[PDB]
Amino acid sequence: MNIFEMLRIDEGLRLKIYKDTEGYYTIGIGHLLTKSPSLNAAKCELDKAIGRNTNGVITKDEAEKLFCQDVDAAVRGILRNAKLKPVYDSLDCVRRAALINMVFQMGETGVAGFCNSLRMLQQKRWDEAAVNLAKSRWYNQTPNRAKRVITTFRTGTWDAYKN
Ligand SMILES: [Cl-]
Ligand SMILES: [Cl-]
Ligand code: NA
Ligand code: NA
Ligand code: NA
Ligand code: NA
């Protein structure tokens, strides 16, 4: 298991424009296109992202290319953020993937505001952090995914992504 396999489990793979769990136009492995309600706006974003006239459909290779970029962008967003970088730097490789997963799903700004959960993670108070992370809109709206990510923070293992 690694961050790519983990996000592929959590995000799935779809080759045509779909709506994510928040109702927003998306494609591939959780590549958010736009928050605009306009499908035409989403199609412009898609053609721009892929570099061709896609008609709302992409290939697996194209989806994986966007995914490469999006994982990289989540990591760069962590490293540039004054609240997230110290936490990321304090974590082991497996728990770093859990933090990347959160940022991929919710964005840097949202995660960076969880000052209590972040402190508990940096303090390595894993069970406390896990309880605190569940007191979130994130956990309530996507509980199965959040449980997997939280178990990853709690244990430092990939156990929640087996089977
Ligand atoms: Cl555009
Ligand atoms: Cl879920
Ligand atoms: Na939906
Ligand atoms: Na992606
Ligand atoms: Na505490
Ligand atoms: Na603890």
Side-chain angles (χ1 to χ4, degrees):
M1 188 68 43
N2 60 54
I3 179 63
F4 292 94
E5 292 185 29
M6 174 215 210
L7 277 165
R8 165 72 181 80
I9 287 163
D10 286 336
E11 295 292 347
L13 166 71
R14 298 173 76 179
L15 300 184
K16 302 166 190 303
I17 291 174
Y18 63 99
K19 287 183 183 182
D20 72 6
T21 66
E22 299 289 352
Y24 295 134
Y25 294 120
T26 301
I27 198 151
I29 305 166
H31 181 82
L32 176 60
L33 289 164
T34 183
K35 289 183 188 187
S36 166
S38 166
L39 177 61
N40 284 338
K43 282 175 170 183
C44 287
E45 298 283 6
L46 182 55
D47 289 357
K48 179 179 55 178
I50 304 300
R52 67 186 180 79
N53 192 316
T54 69
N55 196 29
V57 186
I58 62 173
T59 70
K60 184 160 180 178
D61 282 354
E62 286 166 346
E64 292 173 341
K65 176 64 154 331
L66 293 185
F67 189 40
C68 186
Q69 285 168 11
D70 291 343
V71 172
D72 250 25
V75 175
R76 294 320 272 270
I78 288 167
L79 295 173
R80 82 200 227 243
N81 185 282
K83 301 310 197 217
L84 297 175
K85 185 178 182 291
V87 181
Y88 183 83
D89 285 347
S90 73
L91 293 170
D92 58 275
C93 212
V94 177
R95 294 187 172 93
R96 278 175 183 170
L99 190 65
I100 297 161
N101 190 311
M102 293 176 79
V103 171
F104 188 103
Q105 184 184 356
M106 291 172 272
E108 171 184 320
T109 312
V111 183
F114 294 178
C115 66
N116 304 112
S117 292
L118 296 175
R119 178 187 77 249
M120 287 176 205
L121 288 171
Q122 186 150 348
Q123 297 173 316
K124 307 196 172 290
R125 295 177 180 195
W126 306 124
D127 276 33
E128 293 86 358
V131 163
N132 192 253
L133 281 163
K135 302 185 341 113
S136 67
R137 178 179 186 278
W138 171 55
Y139 176 97
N140 285 99
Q141 307 291 319
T142 52
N144 285 159
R145 180 186 184 158
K147 294 171 177 179
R148 287 191 292 273
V149 173
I150 289 167
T151 290
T152 308
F153 280 127
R154 180 177 55 83
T155 67
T157 78
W158 295 115
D159 286 2
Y161 290 85
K162 294 317 110 142
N163 321 129

